[PDB]
Amino acid sequence: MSTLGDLLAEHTVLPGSAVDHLHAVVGEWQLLADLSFADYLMWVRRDDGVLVCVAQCRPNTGPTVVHTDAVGTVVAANSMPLVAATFSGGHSVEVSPVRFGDQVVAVLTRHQPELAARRRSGHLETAYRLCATDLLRMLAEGTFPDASRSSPRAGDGFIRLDVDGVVSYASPNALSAYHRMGLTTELEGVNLIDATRPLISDPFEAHEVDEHVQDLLAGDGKGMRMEVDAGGATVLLRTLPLVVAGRNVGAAILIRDVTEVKR
């Protein structure tokens, strides 16, 4: 009886809406573990005030520090004072809440390698860690996840857009994919739509992408997954609007060149 669903039914009295939301978190948090270069555990609090670990993720972009399976672990609340308190007043372990409605419905613990063993902070690792912090804030504010097997992983290609839709960071993989798509220009410092629109092969899709990204940034649209042909290449795109305290602070875009994977 080991799934998140079985565990939440056994140990918890969360309503079906919050149960859905936690299922959605676990369905999405590979991206968080990858961008953080960290392990996460998800903890719920029963009636008893007793704590249960109901899910766990490891990063694919670096070593785990949680080699043992933690799921199903049931622990007295005072053996984890902070986690217990995060349910209340709201490894190198950081603790953060997951909100739904306005209740903390779960708490994540983040575990990662001690300082000299970790992914040295080049630009890629900085841009990823900064995005992980943005999503952790959305988790705490109850705005991510909102409401697939094939979507890009962070390592496939990562782009950070600022509020005006200007690329503030593009990973080497993302730049690789845009070159295969026909980009002969830099990506960083350029309006993403202006760089992207001319590359897209079908003129209807070109406009769809343009409108999507405009809506994303405006708060008019949710993130989407899409497959686009450009320049002989086929890329998969996944967009994620980023928000603080009810406002848009740009977007993350994941991209995967699937030209040869497709075929």
Q: Rule CB under 5 A: which residues touch Br ion?
A: 30-31, 60, 63-64, 66-69, 80, 82-83, 113-114, 117, 124, 127, 130, 148-150, 153, 155, 160, 165, 169, 171-173, 186-188, 193, 197-198, 201, 224-225, 229
Residue 192 CB, shortest distance to Br ion, in Å, is: 6
Cα gap 88→95, rounded to integer Å: 13
Strands across the sheet containing 51-57? 74-75, 51-57, 39-45, 103-111, 94-100
Does the footprint of a copy of itself cover residue 71 (CB under 8 A)? yes
Short-list 220, 213, 215, 218, CA closest to 238? 213
Partner whose binding site includes residue 202, from a copy of itself, Br ion, none (CB under 5 to 8 Å by kind): none
Whats the size of the chain, residue-wise? 263
Does the footprint of a copy of itself cover residue 226 (CB under 8 A)? no
Short-list 85, 88, 11, CA closest to 52? 11
Instruction: Specify the stretch interacting with a copy of itself by CB under 8 A; choose among 82-90, 207-215, 216-224, 232-240.
Output: 232-240
Using CB under 8 A, count the residues that bind a copy of itself: 54
What burial letters (b/e) apply to 78-108, b meaning 16+ CB within 10 Å?
A: eebeebbebbeeeeeeebbbbbbeeebbbbb
Joined together, the tokens standing for residue 261 give 């994977």
Cis peptide before 145 (omega within 30 of 0): yes
Does the footprint of a copy of itself cover residue 67 (CB under 8 A)? yes
Partner whose binding site includes residue 109, from a copy of itself, Br ion, none (CB under 5 to 8 Å by kind): none
Joined together, the tokens standing for residue 2 give 């080991």
Nearest to a copy of itself of 141, 229 (CB atom): 229
Does the footprint of a copy of itself cover residue 182 (CB under 8 A)? yes
Give SS3 for 226: strand
Binding residues for a copy of itself, rule: CB under 8 A, are 1-6, 23-24, 26-27, 55-56, 58-64, 66-69, 71, 117, 119-120, 122, 124-125, 148-150, 153, 155-156, 172-173, 175-176, 179-182, 231-233, 236, 258-263
